Design a binder for this molecule. Sequence first.
Ligand SMILES: [Ca+2]
Ligand SMILES: [Cl-]
Ligand SMILES: [Cl-]
Lengths: 34, 223
Amino acid sequence: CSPSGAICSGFGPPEQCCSGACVPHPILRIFVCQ
Amino acid sequence: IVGGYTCGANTVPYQVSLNSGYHFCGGSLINSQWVVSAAHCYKSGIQVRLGEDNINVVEGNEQFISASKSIVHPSYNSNTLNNDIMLIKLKSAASLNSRVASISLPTSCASAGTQCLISGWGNTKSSGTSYPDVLKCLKAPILSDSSCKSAYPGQITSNMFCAGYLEGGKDSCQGDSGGPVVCSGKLQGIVSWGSGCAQKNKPGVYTKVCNYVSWIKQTIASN
Ligand SMILES: [Ca+2]
Ligand SMILES: [Cl-]
Ligand SMILES: [Cl-]
């Protein structure tokens, strides 16, 4: 699982991220792990 | 892409998806072995997906090629987002065809008012949960450097330009990072950042590719 702040995918499941939330970055046009 | 339209299958043949299990950034194919994307899209274990339209469903024109090298600009400044550009080398050359094709690098910088094509598989709504599948497109003008600085006081570098609309509802968005801004058949921009997406008076901000052509050429030649 990816640590907080890591890049992740808006298409993927919550378990991409250790935190269980992959969210849109407020500035960069990527999703990141909460 | 918010407020755009369905491109049509493979009508943007230089658009690639950077994948790590799932799509996470866009990019632009600049020759059979190299892709341009954003420095902030850098991570290990990237697979480049070429010839995609519906990113969830196999349609038959895809090529899946691992990245062998990822080269972030040596002056990328993650604090200011200056020099937000990366080159990715493919492990093997893509097979070029009508649906998988490179986009030319610029021979000069584009002027304000120039109309451009921005594309990607990012969010299609400016808030809430999107469910994108096929590639989306947006036609958007390059904004004057003064209007860009007015929208983002104290934050615009000489390696960025704004493109899009001040009224809201038409913009690139999360998941579009690294993707192309193409104007008159040349790659002028890379989807980079903005204050949220499609917000009034906050157009998208894009890496100005024309400032990096010599660095691009040098990186290709030396790698
Ligand atoms: Ca597909
Ligand atoms: Cl895919
Ligand atoms: Cl700098």
